[PDB]
Design a protein around this nucleic acid. Structure first.
Lengths: 51, 133, 201, 148, 309
RNA sequence: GCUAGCGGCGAGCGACGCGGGAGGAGCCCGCCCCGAAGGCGCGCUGUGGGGCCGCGAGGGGGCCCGAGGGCCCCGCCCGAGAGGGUGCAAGCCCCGUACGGCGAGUAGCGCUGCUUGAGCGUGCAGCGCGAAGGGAGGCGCGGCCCUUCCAAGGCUAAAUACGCCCCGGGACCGAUAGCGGACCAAGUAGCGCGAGCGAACGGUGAAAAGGACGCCCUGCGGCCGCUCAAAAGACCUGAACCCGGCCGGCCGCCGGCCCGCCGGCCCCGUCUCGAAACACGGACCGAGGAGCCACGCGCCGCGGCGAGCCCGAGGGAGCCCCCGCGGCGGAGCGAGCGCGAGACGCCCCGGGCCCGCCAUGCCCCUGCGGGCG
């Protein structure tokens, strides 16, 4: 009953989809200390988006 | 058009009413055109057909004039003396060809007394209408 | 569709669909109903030709803090309101004013509203008596629809002085509002703490 | 419009769009939302979060009128004022003739602040005012008066 | 722009301004949709008797008797199935169906307005099938006082150019082509002019005229304005009706007429404008294809590719 | 309103209060005051009072047809050109139509049972026990209030529902359909001891003109013909299957060719991994025969209008016209008390911030309150 024949042909029908650009550069799982300091550096001089 | 709802405009209701109607209604339905000469004398366009009337057929094959020997209201037709089907055997009794009364013009009427009374009632009712109601 | 993302339907299953009382109510008689109500209305109007079909009813604040701003028409004028005009309930009914003993004004402003409505109606009403007076009756003209229909006036902007207005509002109004709102909870909790403080020494 | 329908086109095909190996049969997945904790758990977990269980306190009767509290943002307060009156008010300014808008009369009980009011002073009257709303109107020189 | 008014005599009695409804953009799609929806709302419900084919008592005989398993009576007569003679239809028609379709007021008004506007277009009327060659102007505004006699109305119509349309209708009456003949719908005539009347009591005079219909400016009907979901009907306006059209179409609460649009010719003139043509840049000259013939075989053919050879 | 609730909190179930309408009308007894004043053979164990009937327009000629209601020319009446009939398709041949006239075994409570969305009870009931100023306010209990009303007696129109029956209309069905039943005799003929079941069957033609005559035949019957436009002759049209004559061939299909030769062809439908299958269904032919409708949901396309939008019910001598609320959207989030979004931006996408919820630390008024990080 168990069988995986035709699984690879089915996967390669239009597959090998890459993960996505947001995934490669993300703030997920990163060191919380790194994230906090990054926000302070951004919040000054040109990068600051604060009004 | 018809502005009254009571009268039916259905083909089904109309045909059933004509096909099965009381004899009083069969009479009016079996009216026939009074002649130009009679109309001028009596002032009625059409009078109901009777058994002493002499009538001239004006459309159907057999267009002659004769007295109405018989009226069969059930068949909605009248029989005129002298208009018959061709008796196949020469020594045979004639069978009348029924003519519809619409196909006829009334040359003469059986005057009676009730006919005269009926003619007068219409003459006064038509006068109310001619007086623009 | 087949599964996938569908909110679940909250329409109840049909009951008595094959047998039982008819739970389907068709509306193909709706246009005919309109003609019927007008015909009954026309017949009734003629029966009291001078008199309006609808009796005078009172302006009443619509209930709830949701509609407390607007006013609608109520069953009848309160005995106090009729007394203010000077009409007894029975005399008022003959004039055409519906009377409700049950209603209580609940205000002094509510009474003023209706007493003014009653006063206006008394002017608008004309009593045709004198046995038969046909010529006056022929041109009487029956009022049609609700009598004195209630009018709900829309909000209009007004001019006010910020200096005088700032006198009534405390500075930091939010603190004043948030303190009033939570006073009961703050007071109970601080009593709960007084018992704990009392129950330590 | 029956004529322009998928079913009519599929006449002449036998199974009528429903398959041979599996055919249209009556309710082969059960009737209604059933088996959502058993056979259909996959779908109910995937697209229906919070469907099963009890999550909150219960009010046996809910009085909608008292739980009704309509709110207006600080951005739309000037919009309520009619345009003819509003256009002159902004140029005229004036502490003495500052516009009074009873948002309660328009139909809103609490003033929240989502946007920015115009600088000309305005007096707003409402049952309640959010703290940010009180601060913004106070910055525009307006008064947050209460209404009865 | 003012529309000429011709009296019963037929000679330019007065001038009246064009009502702004006739400036409404000509949308045929909005008309067809509201016409289709409003014709359905007039339909009377039909259904079969719920108790048809269910009145009999039939039980499937069962397996083993060499007979198909469909309900059969005492005799053994097939019953209670869509395939059995005397059986209930598989899905019986019911009056629960939605016989009426809702329309937004605005969309209905847009259609009625674009239909009156279509009457003004000269070709739309001829396209619909009215005979309008002798008609002086569109819209036809005729000052006709109260008319109670068909002969008076016929003279008006003859003197204003509509007799040929009335005669197309008179000589178009025939028996229908279906069971509709039997179902109290026996005779069909061709649709003719629509006379819009305001306070001019011309209804009695024009009612028995063949193919002609009447409608107070108070209630113009879109099924009338566009018969067959095809707009373009000759309308013989009474002069009160035109003079009241700006009133009728303003008494519509605060309904504002749909803003005027453009036409293919007014898109063509716009396209031919100097600015549009000046922007146009001619394209690169196209490719030459020329089907392959053997190059090696002929001296001239080889010389195009190998002249030295 | 559609959700407050209820439910192996599962499947499902499910009100009301606002608000807009139609319609509106209020009262009476006991108790108590009199005490026969009364309905007086009674009663003081309390009577009495407080729709029919009508008239009803205007057409000829020509040709042809079995017969126009057809055609071809010319006209007339329309407040009537809604229809039906009449020998074919009739505004004018007939009928009609439009236009007329004349408060106690109670409330409650205990226990049970039924029930309800009603949840420590939504209403009812048994039994037990039983008040007095009581009832209610949607979480029980005991206090204290506050609003609101008066159960255990009775009446009451209207707006609403609906079959037989009659009337009218239909984007309905057209005789295996439409009611079981279109047929002078259908719940009939028939069937079952009975309860009960339950058919079949429409059409000659304009007019029955429903068949003149003669020939024969032992006779039947046949034959001619007749009537009629036609036999349409027991009946309109008269298909398929099937069959008989006479004539013509030797033959399933597909292709080439003059045409009977060569070549190729397994029996369909259907389940099935796989059917020509020793799988199943199928003698043959005709007619009928199966994703329709309602409501809910998800999404798409279009059309109107746009912080708006909306034929709701309804109401307007109003007909497809006009006027016409909720609702839905515009603010979210938190179990809830409650609190409450602007900072960027073609679009998309991440980031950053803001709001709520869960913390944390500071500062201070109107303080378990506020603000700020």
């Amino acid at each position: 009953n168990h069988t995986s024949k035709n699984q690879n042909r089915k996967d390669h029908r239009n597959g090998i989809k890459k993960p996505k650009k947001s995934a490669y550069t993300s703030h997920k799982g990163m060191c919380p200390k790194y994230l906090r300091n990054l926000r302070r550096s951004r919040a000054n001089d040109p990068r600051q988006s604060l009004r | 058009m018809k502005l009254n709802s009571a009268v039916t405009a259905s083909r089904r209701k109309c045909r059933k009413a004509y096909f099965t109607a009381n004899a009083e209604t069969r009479a009016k339905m079996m009216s026939s055109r009074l002649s130009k000469e009679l109309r001028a004398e009596h002032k009625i366009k059409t009078m109901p057909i009777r058994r002493g009337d002499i009538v001239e057929i004006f459309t159907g094959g057999h267009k002659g004039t004769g007295k109405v020997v018989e009226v069969r209201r059930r068949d909605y037709k009248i029989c005129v003396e002298g208009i018959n089907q061709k008796a196949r055997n020469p020594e045979a009794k004639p069978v009348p060809y029924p003519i519809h009364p619409s196909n006829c013009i009334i040359k003469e009427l059986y005057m009676n007394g009730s006919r005269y009374r009926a003619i007068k009632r219409r003459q006064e009712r038509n006068a109310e209408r001619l007086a623009r109601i | 569709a087949m599964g996938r993302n569908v909110a679940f339907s909250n329409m109840r299953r049909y009951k008595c669909t094959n047998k039982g009382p008819n739970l389907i109510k068709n509306w193909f008689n709706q246009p005919a109903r309109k003609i019927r109500r007008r015909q009954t209305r026309l017949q009734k109007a003629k029966a009291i030709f001078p008199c309006p079909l609808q009796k005078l009813r009172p302006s009443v604040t619509r209930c709830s803090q949701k509609f407390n701003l607007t006013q609608r028409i109520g069953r009848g004028f309160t005995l106090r309101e009729l007394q203010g005009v000077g009409l007894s309930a029975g005399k008022a009914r003959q004039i055409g004013i519906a009377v409700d003993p049950r209603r209580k004004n609940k205000s002094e402003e509510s009474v003023a509203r209706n007493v003014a409505r009653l006063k206006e109606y008394l002017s608008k009403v004309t009593i045709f008596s004198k046995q038969a007076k046909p010529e006056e009756i022929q041109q009487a003209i029956q009022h049609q629809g609700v009598v004195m229909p209630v009018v709900n006036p829309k909000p209009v902007i007004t001019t006010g002085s910020i200096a005088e207005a700032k006198k009534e509002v405390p500075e930091n109004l939010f603190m004043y509002l948030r303190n009033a709102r939570t006073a009961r909870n703050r007071a109970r909790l601080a009593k709960r703490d007084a018992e704990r403080e009392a129950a330590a020494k | 419009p029956t004529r322009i329908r998928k079913s009519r086109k599929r006449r002449g095909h036998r199974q009528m769009g429903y398959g041979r190996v599996g055919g249209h049969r009556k309710h082969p997945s059960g009737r209604g939302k059933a088996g959502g904790l058993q056979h259909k758990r996959t779908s109910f977990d995937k697209y229906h979060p919070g469907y099963f269980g009890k999550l909150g306190m219960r009010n046996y009767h809910v009085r909608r009128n008292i739980e009704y509290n309509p709110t207006i943002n600080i951005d739309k307060i000037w919009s309520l004022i009619p345009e003819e009156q509003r256009d002159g008010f902004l140029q005229r300014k004036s502490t003495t003739e500052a516009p009074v808008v009873d948002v309660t009369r328009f139909g809103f009980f609490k003033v929240l602040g989502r946007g920015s009011l115009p600088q000309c002073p305005i007096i707003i009257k409402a049952r309640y005012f959010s703290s940010d709303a009180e601060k913004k109107l106070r910055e525009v020189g307006g008064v947050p008066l209460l209404v009865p | 722009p003012t529309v000429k008014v011709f009296g019963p005599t037929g000679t330019q009695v007065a001038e009246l301004p064009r009502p702004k409804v006739f400036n409404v953009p000509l949308r045929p799609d909005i008309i067809n949709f509201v016409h289709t929806q409003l014709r359905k709302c007039l339909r009377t419900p039909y259904a079969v008797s719920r108790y048809a084919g269910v009145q009999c008592t039939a039980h499937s005989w069962g397996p083993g008797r060499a007979v198909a398993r469909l309900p059969r009576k005492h005799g053994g007569i097939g019953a209670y199935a869509n395939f059995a003679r005397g059986g209930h239809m598989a899905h019986p028609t019911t009056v629960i169906r939605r016989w009426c379709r809702k329309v937004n007021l605005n969309q209905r008004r847009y259609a009625v307005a674009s239909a009156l506007a279509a009457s003004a277009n000269a070709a739309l009327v001829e396209a619909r099938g009215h005979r309008i060659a002798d008609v002086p102007s569109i819209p036809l505004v005729v000052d006709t006082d109260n008319v109670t006699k068909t002969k008076d109305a016929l003279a008006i119509i003859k003197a204003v150019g509509v007799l040929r349309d009335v005669e197309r209708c008179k000589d178009s009456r025939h028996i229908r082509a279906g069971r509709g003949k039997m179902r109290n719908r026996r005779y069909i005539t061709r649709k003719g002019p629509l006379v819009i009347y305001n306070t001019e009591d011309v209804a009695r005079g024009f009612r028995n005229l063949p193919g002609v219909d009447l409608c107070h400016v108070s209630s113009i009907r879109l099924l009338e304005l566009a018969p067959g979901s095809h707009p373009g009907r000759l309308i013989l306006w009474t002069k009160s009706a035109f003079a009241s059209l700006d009133d009728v179409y303003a008494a519509k609460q605060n309904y504002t007429l749909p803003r005027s649009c453009i036409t293919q010719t007014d898109i063509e003139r716009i396209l031919q404008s100097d600015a549009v043509q000046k922007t146009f840049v001619p394209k690169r000259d196209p490719l030459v294809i020329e089907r392959k013939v053997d190059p090696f075989s002929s001296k001239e053919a080889l010389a195009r590719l190998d002249p030295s050879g």
